[PDB]
Design an enzyme around this catalytic site. Structure first.
Site, PDB file in Angstrom:
ATOM      1  CG  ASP A  41    -110.547 -85.033  67.729  1.00 37.35           C
ATOM      2  OD1 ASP A  41    -110.701 -86.646  67.161  1.00 37.35           O
ATOM      3  OD2 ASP A  41    -110.699 -84.264  67.840  1.00 37.35           O
ATOM      4  CD  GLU A  46    -112.665 -79.589  64.405  1.00 34.59           C
ATOM      5  OE1 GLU A  46    -111.986 -79.683  65.678  1.00 34.59           O
ATOM      6  OE2 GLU A  46    -113.817 -79.500  64.291  1.00 34.59           O
ATOM      7  CG  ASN A  88    -111.533 -89.215  66.412  1.00 37.86           C
ATOM      8  OD1 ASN A  88    -112.083 -90.815  66.360  1.00 37.86           O
ATOM      9  ND2 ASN A  88    -111.725 -89.062  67.390  1.00 37.86           N
ATOM     10  CG  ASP A 108    -113.972 -92.562  70.686  1.00 35.71           C
ATOM     11  OD1 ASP A 108    -113.200 -91.823  71.641  1.00 35.71           O
ATOM     12  OD2 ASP A 108    -115.024 -92.753  70.739  1.00 35.71           O
ATOM     13  CG  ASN A 142    -112.444 -87.689  70.575  1.00 32.13           C
ATOM     14  OD1 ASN A 142    -111.381 -88.735  69.222  1.00 32.13           O
ATOM     15  ND2 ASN A 142    -112.163 -86.284  70.633  1.00 32.13           N
ATOM     16  CB  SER A 195    -110.688 -92.120  69.343  1.00 33.72           C
ATOM     17  OG  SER A 195    -111.916 -91.185  69.493  1.00 33.72           O
TER      18      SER A 195
END
Ligand code: NA
Ligand SMILES: [Rh+]
Length: 129
Positions: free
Chosen positions: A52, A35, A59, A48, A46, A50
Site C-alpha cells: 500500500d 491510512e 494497493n 499477499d 500486505n 502487495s
C-alpha cells in the site's frame, strides 16, 4: 510530505474529492489520517506480497505497478512511486477510480473501521475551505 489536516482538506477539495461519489470531504480526510497519518511517503507491505502506497494507502494488487507484485493489475496506469509524491494528484485521481468501482469507500479498511458512521465533518472543522 506530511500534510496538516486543513492543508490536506484544501488540497483534496481543490482536486475534486469533496462529495465525490457522495463522500463529503471529512470522509477523505479521516481516511487519510488513519491510512497514512497524512504522510505521502507511507508504505506498508500486505501478507499477499502487495504493498500500500501514499496518503490513501493504495494497493499494488490492483491499482499501480511496483515491479514486485506478480500477477497484479495497474488499473490507475501509474508506477506506485507516483503515489508517494508531495503532489497528491496521482493519489486523488487513482482514489476516484477506486471509489467508483462498486464498494465505495469500503475499499479503505481504515475508513470502514474508523470513519464510517462517525461525525467525519469534525475532520474539516475550523478549516478555511
Ligand atoms: Na500492480
Ligand atoms: Rh495540488
Amino acid at each position: 510530505k506530511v500534510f496538516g489536516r486543513c492543508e490536506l482538506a484544501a488540497a483534496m477539495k481543490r482536486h475534486g474529492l469533496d462529495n465525490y461519489r457522495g463522500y463529503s470531504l471529512g470522509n477523505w480526510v479521516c481516511a487519510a489520517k488513519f491510512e497514512s497519518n497524512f504522510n505521502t511517503q507511507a508504505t506498508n507491505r500486505n501478507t499477499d506480497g502487495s504493498t500500500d502506497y501514499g496518503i490513501l494507502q493504495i494497493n499494488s494488487r490492483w491499482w499501480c505497478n511496483d515491479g514486485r507484485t506478480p500477477g497484479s493489475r495497474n488499473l490507475c496506469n501509474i508506477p506506485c512511486s507516483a503515489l508517494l509524491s508531495s503532489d497528491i494528484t496521482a493519489s486523488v485521481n487513482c482514489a476516484k477510480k477506486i471509489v467508483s468501482d462498486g464498494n465505495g469507500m469500503n475499499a479503505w479498511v481504515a475508513w470502514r473501521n474508523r470513519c464510517k458512521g462517525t461525525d467525519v465533518q469534525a475532520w474539516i472543522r475550523g478549516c478555511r475551505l
